[PDB]
Amino acid sequence: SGFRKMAFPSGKVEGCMVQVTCGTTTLNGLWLDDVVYCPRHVICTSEDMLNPNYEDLLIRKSNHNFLVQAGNVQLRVIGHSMQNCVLKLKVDTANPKTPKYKFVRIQPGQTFSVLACYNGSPSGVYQCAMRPNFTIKGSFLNGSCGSVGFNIDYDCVSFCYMHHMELPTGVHAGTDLEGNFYGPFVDRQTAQAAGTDTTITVNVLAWLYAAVINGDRWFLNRFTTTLNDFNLVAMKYNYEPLTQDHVDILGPLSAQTGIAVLDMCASLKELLQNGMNGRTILGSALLEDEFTPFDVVRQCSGVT
Amino acid sequence: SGFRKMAFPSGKVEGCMVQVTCGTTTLNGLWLDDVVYCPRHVICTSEDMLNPNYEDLLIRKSNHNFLVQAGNVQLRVIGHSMQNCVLKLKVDTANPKTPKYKFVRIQPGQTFSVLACYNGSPSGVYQCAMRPNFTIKGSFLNGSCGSVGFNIDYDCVSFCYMHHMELPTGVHAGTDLEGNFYGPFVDRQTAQAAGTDTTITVNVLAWLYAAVINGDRWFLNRFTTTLNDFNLVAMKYNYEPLTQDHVDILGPLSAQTGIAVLDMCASLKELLQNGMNGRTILGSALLEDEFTPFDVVRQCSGVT
Numbered sequence A, B: 001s002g003f004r005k006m007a008f009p010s011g012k013v014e015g016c017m018v019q020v021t022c023g024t025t026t027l028n029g030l031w032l033d034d035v036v037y038c039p040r041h042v043i044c045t046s047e048d049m050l051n052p053n054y055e056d057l058l059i060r061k062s063n064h065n066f067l068v069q070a071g072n073v074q075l076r077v078i079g080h081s082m083q084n085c086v087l088k089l090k091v092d093t094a095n096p097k098t099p100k101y102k103f104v105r106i107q108p109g110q111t112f113s114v115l116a117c118y119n120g121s122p123s124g125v126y127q128c129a130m131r132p133n134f135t136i137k138g139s140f141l142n143g144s145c146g147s148v149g150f151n152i153d154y155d156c157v158s159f160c161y162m163h164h165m166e167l168p169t170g171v172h173a174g175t176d177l178e179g180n181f182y183g184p185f186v187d188r189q190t191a192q193a194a195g196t197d198t199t200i201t202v203n204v205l206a207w208l209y210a211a212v213i214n215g216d217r218w219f220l221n222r223f224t225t226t227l228n229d230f231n232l233v234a235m236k237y238n239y240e241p242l243t244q245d246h247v248d249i250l251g252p253l254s255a256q257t258g259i260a261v262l263d264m265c266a267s268l269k270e271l272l273q274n275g276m277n278g279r280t281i282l283g284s285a286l287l288e289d290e291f292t293p294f295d296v297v298r299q300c301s302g303v304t
């Protein structure tokens, strides 16, 4: 029992972190096989930041300008290419610690672990969700760029995020491992609107099921609702509309607890309309949306 | 910017996890050098649980009865001994992945990361605090016993906790790595009173400083207080009394922000007396006490 905001064990990812320096800029790279992936803004100086012409800046660089260091050893760079907002530095040595891996583009509302790094060294690990507006609320300081987000399925690490930028609002933006930004963001030092965010309804319901499984049941009520009625409430409270696909994904948790999804929706409806009245659920005084239904089942079943 | 409940990178600890089986019981062990540490209750059956005579149960066991498996390879057990509530299984092979390590007994109110494991395999990592009453609010299922808590200082892992038990209340109890329980707990299947818990005042103030550093400042007020006046409020709200040692530990955060510790105490006093009024601080609707002043500085400075 107990329910925590659990991250994946970061070991397989720690073995891939390297430091990449170009000119006077240092950030993190991800070394998989004989390629090191890092944000392309490593080639920028301070004057470039506002409106960089990455193609021109990269043309002034040669393989020997990209200093890649894996802990204490130096990697020899034999190729460089830009793919969207990432640089791919071909090195002459395959990473001996390369785990089984995939590059994936996650959907908004999905969760992943971040291994925050500075100078190629891991500092900490935390779990977060990709917001519906494609930002993440991380913990990143200057030098953390190139830190990655990932999920693990037994022995396979699916890398889904590489950190690039902190928006003026203090929220974070980045790319998939092919260098495509999540959201409308560009790698420029400029104010950039992040869309209106919403609460991930299916995740809140998953977390309410986790609460019931772990003994927090005070919020269960005598009511039910419909998808239409619940969605009128979700609209008013800036929650994502619930669909039958979301109900279907909540099926295993509904079966385990015996609480029909629409009955849990009626509990969530009452919590939205009345608040918590100074009470808590799983140690939180707000409705938590950073656990997917898959996360709840995994944590509640002890998947390793 | 941003502030997260960050765990240490778990890689150095993942390399030490093994599975220990004795009879029909399987749990986790920690393999450091040529010794495997695990909870002594691995030698119990279901009838033993209520009042085990561990000395007698251990006498019926021989080295070959303790099956230790590190991933896919079997370790040869050449010695066994019980030290308090832990068993130490001497093996013929030193763990090649043994990091630099220490065994430490942490103080209540201090924080650490837990690498939850099942069958010797890591499932997830999370950060928590040792409560003032010596329990931890973890996320542990049957089979997680032997999972450990730790802190990391550059390359040295200080192991501070080994998981043993879930109390009937759903909170967790365990030992230091010498097998001494934190708190009054015994490794028996019985109802055991956990003392009255309190909120870790110095940690809440550290987290309020983290909030100010990261932009959440609405709670700052025009007031100040004294240690005596603040402690009358801490008493009423079940908070640990603040001492000059706690004020001194908050010195670096007070210096960085320019907010005197007693002025932050007056902000905390107003939050205790009036609540949050439906507002949030660092994404929380309650006063968070699982970050020490050291954690706040480490996260805010990017220590790797």
Ligand SMILES: Cc1ccncc1CC(=O)Nc1cccc2c1CNCC2
Pocket: A041, A044, A045, A048, A049, A050, A052, A140, A141, A142, A143, A144, A145, A164, A165, A166, A167, A186, A187, A188, A189, B001
């Ligand atoms: C300060 C910080 C904190 C947390 N996470 C990231 C950062 C740095 C950042 O946003 N860098 C950046 C992002 C887009 C483009 C460029 C840069 C840097 N100059 C080159 C052009």
Ligand SMILES: Cc1ccncc1CC(=O)Nc1cccc2c1CNCC2
Pocket: A001, B041, B044, B045, B048, B049, B050, B052, B140, B141, B142, B143, B144, B145, B164, B165, B166, B167, B186, B187, B188, B189
């Ligand atoms: C079920 C669970 C969930 C989370 N964490 C731990 C557990 C198991 C547990 O409390 N075991 C235990 C703790 C003290 C003593 C003994 C045992 C087992 N039998 C032997 C004597």
